[PDB]
């Protein structure tokens with residue numbers, strides 16, 4: 001029904017430059033136009049809008065017209081606009097009317113425009129049109145869109161009683177329009193409006209569409225509602241246009257600058273990403289214009305989460321190259337890679353800024369694909385970085401294919417203990433080229449080994465946040481001796497050895513578990529009020545759900 005057998009025209013209805021024998025039939029079923037109607041520079045004889053009841057003018061041509069009909073005739077021929085067939089035009093919600101310079105347009109001087117127009121200071125300008133026009137049928141009582149007995153304008157407005165604020169269907173104080181009508185009505189009900197103030201659900205003029213969740217007397221919380229509907233400005237719809245997507249409750253063209261299209265259980269929605277929304281970008285190397293990230297490149301990675309391909313950090317890439325004039329990298333511009341979670345191909349690091357003792361810049365890198373390899377098949381290559389003390393790939397859980405090369409980093413520690421077979425899946429056999437970094441014996445004696453809270457896997461550097469996996473528990477990627485099970489400011493629970501807080505308002509219990517899960521329906525005791533299995537703050541001040549709040 002809605003559209004940009006169309007019934008609602010979401011936006012403006014612009015007809016301009018149309019030929020004498022053009023099929024305007026698609027419009028026949030059109031009931032409402034949300035913006036304005038513009039009719040200019042055409043040669044057809046009649047504008048067929050049998051069903052047009054309402055023009056809204058929520059956008060308005062020239063600054064004050066919801067209707068604009070101008071210059072619809074051509075001198076060289078007898079083709080021109082004879083009649084505006086608006087036989088059902090009941091109301092215009094904002095904006096005046098401009099009908100001028102239509103040399104053959106008849107009758108427009110007979111219509112009580114001030115009857116159709118809600119705006120009591122809208123500009124009405126009908127003039128210089130048809131000149132030898134026929135009279136209205138005697139039945140039209142002076143007011144017509146046509147020469148025939150069925151082309152009448154019938155009046156709509158009715159002087160009205162105090163109680164009604166301009167909104168009524170007869171002169172009585174008992175004949176008020178329902179609060180939800182934009183303009184006039186033909187009864188006191190939701191379903192009797194000429195046009196809705198807010199939304200239209202399948203007939204009823206309603207202040208919101210049927211909501212995405214509904215209260216349950218049986219569970220005492222909210223739940224998914226099989227009667228739910230989404231907004232398309234005016235029309236409450238069951239599913240969105242073949243083009244569109246759902247953002248919370250509305251239908252939109254596309255997600256806001258903070259969300260991604262997540263496809264789930266037969267509905268495409270717009271969910272918040274949190275930090276940043278995935279952005280794929282081209283890697284360096286074999287298949288690119290760049291064999292190294294460098295000064296002329298590094299901007300092209302901002303806000304990047306997935307690298308399609310590889311990353312290559314070569315010596316001229318860092319120190320510049322005086323001959324061809326690509327300046328040295330500013331070291332702190334490397335923070336740009338903090339946002340990277342995946343590398344599709346390989347990571348190759350052969351030069352690193354001297355004052356940076358680790359690759360913490362990739363502290364969020366999760367997955368090295370090895371979808372392309374680098375020398376004799378290395379998915380990871382860290383070579384001759386003389387100032388690097390620790391890898392620091394705190395997030396890296398997967399290298400999907402290829403071999404590893406970590407050599408000649410004279411000062412590199414913490415890497416001896418690492419179980420690569422947890423990180424690098426596939427055969428282990430022969431995939432490890434690791435040599436001539438800081439000798440283990442020396443590391444052990446400067447105390448540069450895994451934190452005791454680390455499991456026998458190993459770490460990516462010093463401290464409890466560099467572990468591959470914890471001995472006991474973890475909280476936000478940092479190994480801890482204990483969760484706040486029976487003390488500690490934000491009280492907590494464990495699931496598969498991590499700590500999450502209790503539902504924001506359980507009562508914190510001294511020396512006993514506060515909760516065994518997230519949610520109100522799992523606290524040991526509520527610090528506020530309770531409603532069935534659930535701890536809640538504000539009591540349900542209005543049962544917004546099943547049927548009526």
Ligand SMILES: *[C@@H]1O[C@H](CO)[C@@H](O[C@@H]2O[C@H](CO)[C@@H](O)[C@H](O)[C@H]2NC(C)=O)[C@H](O)[C@H]1NC(C)=O
Pocket residue numbers: 355356357358360390392461462
């Ligand atoms: C990884 O290396 C960074 C950068 O070199 C280290 O950060 C420095 O740490 C020392 C403490 O030992 C501070 O006094 C420096 O001022 C820090 N420098 C800057 C600017 O970051 C960090 O210690 C290392 N972190 C890891 C992974 O252990």
Ligand SMILES: *C1O[C@H](CO)[C@@H](O)[C@H](O)[C@H]1NC(C)=O
Pocket residue numbers: 419421422456
């Ligand atoms: C490394 O872990 C894997 C599986 O997680 C296991 O097969 C292997 O025994 C570990 N290596 C050591 C140090 O035993």
Ligand SMILES: *[C@@H]1O[C@H](CO)[C@@H](O)[C@H](O)[C@H]1NC(C)=O
Pocket residue numbers: 031032193194195196200201202203204205
């Ligand atoms: C509201 O929706 C129904 C949907 O079929 C439609 O027929 C009705 O005319 C509309 N009423 C308005 C625009 O107020």
Ligand SMILES: *[C@@H]1O[C@H](CO)[C@@H](O)[C@H](O)[C@H]1NC(C)=O
Pocket residue numbers: 276302303
């Ligand atoms: C990256 O995202 C940040 C944080 O939302 C924002 O300030 C910035 O506009 C983005 N930059 C680019 C080029 O995407």
Ligand SMILES: *[C@@H]1O[C@H](CO)[C@@H](O)[C@H](O)[C@H]1NC(C)=O
Pocket residue numbers: 354355356386387
């Ligand atoms: C690089 O490593 C060497 C070798 O120990 C050290 O002397 C030098 O100061 C380091 N440079 C910086 C600034 O880290």
Ligand SMILES: *[C@@H]1O[C@H](CO)[C@@H](O)[C@H](O)[C@H]1NC(C)=O
Pocket residue numbers: 471472481482
């Ligand atoms: C953590 O794990 C170790 C090794 O199994 C254990 O002996 C130690 O008591 C644990 N510490 C805590 C606080 O649970």
Ligand SMILES: *[C@@H]1O[C@H](CO)[C@@H](O)[C@H](O)[C@H]1NC(C)=O
Pocket residue numbers: 516517522
């Ligand atoms: C807490 O969680 C576990 C498993 O999810 C369950 O054994 C236990 O019964 C729960 N506690 C409550 C409130 O019943």
Ligand SMILES: *[C@H]1O[C@H](CO)[C@@H](O)[C@H](O)[C@H]1NC(C)=O
Pocket residue numbers: 275276338339341363364
């Ligand atoms: C990684 O942590 C840093 C912290 O500043 C942040 O910039 C980035 O969005 C995080 N990304 C992931 C995958 O958590």
